[PDB]
Design an enzyme around this catalytic site. Structure first.
Site, PDB file in Angstrom:
ATOM      1  N   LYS B   6      23.192  -3.476  84.749  1.00  8.42           N
ATOM      2  CA  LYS B   6      24.457  -3.069  85.018  1.00  8.42           C
ATOM      3  C   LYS B   6      25.036  -2.209  84.057  1.00  8.42           C
ATOM      4  O   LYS B   6      25.109  -2.686  82.739  1.00  8.42           O
ATOM      5  CB  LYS B   6      25.331  -4.252  85.262  1.00  8.42           C
ATOM      6  N   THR B  66      23.038  -7.962  89.674  1.00 10.80           N
ATOM      7  CA  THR B  66      23.636  -7.145  88.669  1.00 10.80           C
ATOM      8  C   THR B  66      25.340  -7.286  88.692  1.00 10.80           C
ATOM      9  O   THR B  66      25.740  -7.531  87.755  1.00 10.80           O
ATOM     10  CB  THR B  66      23.299  -5.680  88.884  1.00 10.80           C
ATOM     11  N   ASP B  67      25.619  -7.713  89.773  1.00  9.30           N
ATOM     12  CA  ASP B  67      26.995  -8.221  89.931  1.00  9.30           C
ATOM     13  C   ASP B  67      27.308  -9.275  89.013  1.00  9.30           C
ATOM     14  O   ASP B  67      28.421  -9.754  88.490  1.00  9.30           O
ATOM     15  CB  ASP B  67      27.424  -8.243  91.375  1.00  9.30           C
ATOM     16  N   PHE B 177      26.572  30.705  56.984  1.00  3.93           N
ATOM     17  CA  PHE B 177      24.991  30.563  57.595  1.00  3.93           C
ATOM     18  C   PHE B 177      24.711  31.985  57.250  1.00  3.93           C
ATOM     19  O   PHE B 177      24.905  32.868  57.985  1.00  3.93           O
ATOM     20  CB  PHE B 177      25.381  30.317  59.107  1.00  3.93           C
ATOM     21  N   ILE B 242      24.794  23.396  59.188  1.00  3.29           N
ATOM     22  CA  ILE B 242      24.933  21.974  59.815  1.00  3.29           C
ATOM     23  C   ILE B 242      23.933  21.194  59.184  1.00  3.29           C
ATOM     24  O   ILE B 242      24.249  19.840  58.868  1.00  3.29           O
ATOM     25  CB  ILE B 242      25.050  21.904  61.286  1.00  3.29           C
ATOM     26  N   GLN B 243      22.715  21.552  59.036  1.00  6.99           N
ATOM     27  CA  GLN B 243      21.525  20.718  58.474  1.00  6.99           C
ATOM     28  C   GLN B 243      21.898  19.988  57.192  1.00  6.99           C
ATOM     29  O   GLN B 243      21.950  19.012  56.659  1.00  6.99           O
ATOM     30  CB  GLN B 243      20.329  21.619  58.287  1.00  6.99           C
ATOM     31  N   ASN B 269      26.444  22.232  67.284  1.00  8.26           N
ATOM     32  CA  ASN B 269      27.243  23.402  66.913  1.00  8.26           C
ATOM     33  C   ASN B 269      28.280  23.958  68.003  1.00  8.26           C
ATOM     34  O   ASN B 269      27.657  24.412  68.984  1.00  8.26           O
ATOM     35  CB  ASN B 269      26.535  24.514  66.305  1.00  8.26           C
TER      36      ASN B 269
HETATM   37  O1  AZA Z   1      24.244  25.629  60.800  1.00  7.77           O
HETATM   38  C1  AZA Z   1      23.500  26.274  61.722  1.00  7.77           C
HETATM   39  N1  AZA Z   1      22.371  25.822  61.841  1.00  7.77           N
HETATM   40  C2  AZA Z   1      21.702  26.544  62.661  1.00  7.77           C
HETATM   41  O2  AZA Z   1      20.556  26.311  62.743  1.00  7.77           O
HETATM   42  C3  AZA Z   1      22.359  27.528  63.320  1.00  7.77           C
HETATM   43  N2  AZA Z   1      21.539  28.376  64.026  1.00  7.77           N
HETATM   44  N3  AZA Z   1      22.375  29.513  64.454  1.00  7.77           N
HETATM   45  N4  AZA Z   1      23.428  28.980  63.904  1.00  7.77           N
HETATM   46  C4  AZA Z   1      23.410  27.979  63.212  1.00  7.77           C
HETATM   47  N5  AZA Z   1      24.240  27.384  62.362  1.00  7.77           N
HETATM   48  O1  AZA Z   2      19.506  -3.876  95.649  1.00  6.18           O
HETATM   49  C1  AZA Z   2      19.881  -4.769  94.725  1.00  6.18           C
HETATM   50  N1  AZA Z   2      19.435  -5.159  93.718  1.00  6.18           N
HETATM   51  C2  AZA Z   2      20.028  -5.755  92.724  1.00  6.18           C
HETATM   52  O2  AZA Z   2      19.425  -6.130  91.759  1.00  6.18           O
HETATM   53  C3  AZA Z   2      21.407  -5.966  92.857  1.00  6.18           C
HETATM   54  N2  AZA Z   2      22.071  -6.779  92.367  1.00  6.18           N
HETATM   55  N3  AZA Z   2      23.493  -6.770  93.055  1.00  6.18           N
HETATM   56  N4  AZA Z   2      23.307  -6.115  93.928  1.00  6.18           N
HETATM   57  C4  AZA Z   2      22.017  -5.852  94.116  1.00  6.18           C
HETATM   58  N5  AZA Z   2      21.139  -4.921  94.991  1.00  6.18           N
HETATM   59 CL    CL Z   3      23.309  25.785  65.531  1.00  4.05          CL
HETATM   60 CL    CL Z   4      22.178  -3.018  92.075  1.00  4.33          CL
END
Ligand code: AZA
Ligand code: AZA
Ligand code: CL
Ligand code: CL
Ligand code: AZA
Ligand code: AZA
Ligand code: CL
Ligand code: CL
Lengths: 294, 294, 294, 294
Positions: B6, B66-67, B177, B242-243, B269
């Site tokens: 769920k 799942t309910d 950069f 950024i690296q 970025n």
């Molecule tokens: O910080 C950056 N890393 C990158 O790899 C990069 N490539 N283009 N601009 C960039 N700026």
């Molecule tokens: O098809 C279903 N599978 C499930 O596991 C389920 N759980 N609640 N309703 C459901 N319906």
């Molecule tokens: Cl980048």
């Molecule tokens: Cl489900």
């Protein structure tokens, strides 16, 4: 309708003029913006009757390429001498209409791309870095501006709105939702204590559009301050509904900022289901839309 | 291969036992976790030769729905008395294998759902709220655990790893950069000063798996501390790639935490293009994968 | 671990040599690909002990820029004279290792960017357009290749795998899930007739890796044929579980394609909840993983 | 503004009444919908003066829970006896206003969740399955309806619109963009032969809103037919811009369907960069918005 333009015009600027000289409120420590790093996402739309034949005849003679609009916006961020996204939009709008006489209207949306401060150890102490910032995918400020050219070639702002988008707040207790209609369509139980989880988009409009620009910063309403009002009011309030909450946030905003004309809310309910342990609900979400006015 | 399980088992718990008594490092103010609100996204996978006929014959006799796995996880978050996601996974794994004797192996992935503190005004002063939290879509802690049942019904942990995902850091200057291969495939200009923008996923492994659980919190390595090391080292370093950066972050992590055996980086970025104004690049992104060991 | 490379290298080629002469099967009309439009998303990873100082010393002397790798891939798509993504990866891998003597390992992933035909009318006759295509966000072919330089300087493919990703199939009736374990953790009701909704990712390996290249199309296994086998088997089968279904799909694939050595399934359960009307479930999803061997 | 409601109400109905008797056009093979599987994503918004105190006072007395609106929509899909999403929205809207007298306005959006037919073989013959369907993430039909209660308590549809969303079309040759403004902001080269890649959202309005419901199927305009007109016109046209193309598509639509009053386009430009080989562009995208009227 007849418009065209460019969306997702990202632009990042270093060392914009700082925003300072702001007026404080009790809910918020906000005192300005450093503007070491300033990012905005702009959308531009333009219109005008002289664009008709670009559609009806395929005549590109009066078409400003949308790529050129992108260049225009990015170049103007380099030359912008102001302090707010709102002021930047006015700068772009005024400049664009002055350049292109056949364009009758321009709309701009600007969304802040927010960055948060990080800390570094240097010279024996840990302190806020002036170099390394964290990109935030949480809430962000917004601005909207529409400008028109009149017959006499004067330019007028015809709509301005600022906002805060993407605010996601959960309050773990001190929220109820009871007393709603119980009829043949109701299966929701009443809840006297739920962990209310709301998404908020908050937009405000100024009485005087000039106050939005930041040129007299004491009249500027900062999204940061609006955020802090929202969280404080949520904390303070024994909420009765989301409707109830956003009205109260709106009232506080308008009390703290008398220069505002109105505040508009778009909220969504994403409250978890109880299985204390909770889990994600099914996809459908409630929402509310509400305007509070002075 | 033969497994089933769920995914996206979200579970939110209030008032988990707080994490305190941690050992500090110079790069980080981190001093523990309040655990007023604790969210986790769990993925569970299980295996065992006795599951064969559930595939080959459609025989569900030995199938845990799942309910039911989802119910199992959420119920165990309610009863968990520990302080870390790593310890939660061990709790779930041991319990599950004890319950279901025909299951030979279980894998668990736990991802933190992070929340941030907010401010509120009460009783005269603005202070951190104990009720209202902001959901964050930024970086988050991770944990991984595999456990197996041996022939004698004893249970062994066969792999454990902790991590930090979704860290997005930009350094506005002090990065180069240059000196890379220039041949018929090279069009990239050398750059002596770029605004390096990296995505980081950092994973670490302990010499002693017991140290990951937080039962002796002084031996626990917190994602918050790892984050602060990465921002500090990025700030301190005139990066050459950024690296080069991630090796140095790795060395510092291993120096600060002698109880770790190794650190693994997956970096990307996302550095902006220069049009001072920059904009978003085309979609292709550079990436680096590197392990540093004690 | 010590690798680096480039991800999301999109490349679109027009008029690739068509794939023709593929052996048809009862389940599928597929006979080939016109290749008027050929799109691929490539990820390249390279390694070699000579890369060590690029990390440990910041020495870029033997660094092929990741940007240059992107150039390499795109230039080779222009010169590629073959007919499959599998063959393209081999072309790139061999070429890269021939060019860069200091690289010892290369790993390539190629994902099809699929386009579908559209209709156009000529002389009142509607037929498939040779010019206009629809970009599909549904299922797509995949390919994987790993190649290493041996100590005697020969090149060797150490791993090859083909696949189909993103297949989402719902069968409205003729599916049951009953007879699973019912204990303290079981809340799921037995269902004798559910509208089973499965996501399928299907991957196959050839007995002879040369068959993957398509140079002898009679031996090539097309993702399109695998798709049509999956839907036919789903249709034919009164399913007892997803586990049951994917085993039978696998058996049919291996029966139709004796040149295959194995088929590997990754499935997810997204079956709707019944309120006939159904709705979306909560986020947690079941999944299954199984290998069928020839 | 004062509204609230529910979004992402997914609902899946089996064996809806088939849509039959639709007038075929030369551009399209469409003659109806079998409706073995019928999926819709609905958004409901409601308003009325009597909702005021739910905001201003936290009074929930007249609040229909948004959860109840979800129940309302899903129950009405179960009882709907019509044949179109447009008709379903009318059924929901009329029903909701009849039930809740305090509501003065309702807005509905319905988005098709599309499924495609798949193949199955029986005794040596391949045919379309009546049981197994493929979920499509490509283009989908839309509908919009706004209904109000008048002072004399009659109900009235104030806005209706149908659409096709998510269409992504690329034409590999026979497209130019030349003759646009070249000034200090222009860096875009003219292109006499580009592989124009457009996203299209197409919306139409009927002269008579009744025609939208499908009750008289000969007057119904299917999104499938609009798609096939768009691809045919794209194929036929030596495009001079996207503006030029969408005008011509609009004109053809209104020619084929005299019962339509207008067609509205929202297009985006996603054309690849040339490195014959192309690659993905930087994020900014051009867009166009245009209405053609009958
Ligand atoms: O910080 C950056 N890393 C990158 O790899 C990069 N490539 N283009 N601009 C960039 N700026
Ligand atoms: O098809 C279903 N599978 C499930 O596991 C389920 N759980 N609640 N309703 C459901 N319906
Ligand atoms: Cl980048
Ligand atoms: Cl489900
Ligand atoms: O705050 C809420 N407002 C609502 O309108 C609503 N409806 N269901 N739950 C709700 N919660
Ligand atoms: O079709 C196009 N319309 C435009 O307005 C435009 N601008 N740049 N490229 C363009 N292509
Ligand atoms: Cl709600
Ligand atoms: Cl454009």
């Amino acid at each position: 309708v007849m418009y065209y333009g460019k969306g997702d015009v990202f632009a990042y600027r270093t060392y914009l003029k700082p925003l300072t000289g702001v007026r404080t409120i009790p809910e918020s420590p906000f005192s300005g913006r450093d503007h070491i790093l300033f990012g905005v996402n702009v959308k531009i739309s333009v219109g005008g009757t002289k664009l008709l034949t670009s559609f009806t005849k395929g005549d590109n003679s009066l078409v400003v390429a949308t790529d050129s609009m992108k260049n225009f916006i990015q170049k103007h961020l380099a030359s912008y001498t102001g302090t707010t996204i709102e002021g930047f939009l006015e700068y772009v709008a005024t400049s664009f209409l002055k350049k292109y006489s056949h364009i009758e209207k321009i709309s701009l949306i600007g969304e802040e791309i927010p960055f948060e401060t990080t800390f570094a150890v240097k010279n024996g102490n840990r302190a806020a870095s002036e170099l390394v910032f964290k990109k935030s995918r949480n809430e962000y400020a917004t601005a909207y501006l529409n400008m028109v050219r009149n017959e006499d070639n004067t330019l007028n702002i015809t709509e301005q709105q600022s906002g805060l988008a993407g605010l996601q707040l959960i309050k773990v207790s001190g929220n109820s939702f009871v007393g709603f209609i119980r009829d043949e369509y109701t299966t929701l139980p009443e809840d006297s204590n739920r962990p209310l989880f709301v998404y908020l988009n908050i937009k405000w409009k100024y009485k005087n559009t000039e106050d939005s620009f930041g040129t007299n910063p004491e009249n500027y309403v900062a999204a940061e301050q609006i955020r802090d009002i929202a969280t404080s009011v949520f904390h303070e309030t024994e909420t009765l509904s989301i409707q109830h909450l956003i009205y109260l946030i709106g009232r506080r905003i308008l009390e703290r900022f008398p220069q505002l004309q109105e505040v508009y809310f778009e909220s969504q309910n994403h409250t978890w289901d109880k299985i204390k342990v909770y889990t994600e609900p099914r996809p459908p979400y409630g929402f509310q839309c509400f305007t509070v006015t002075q």
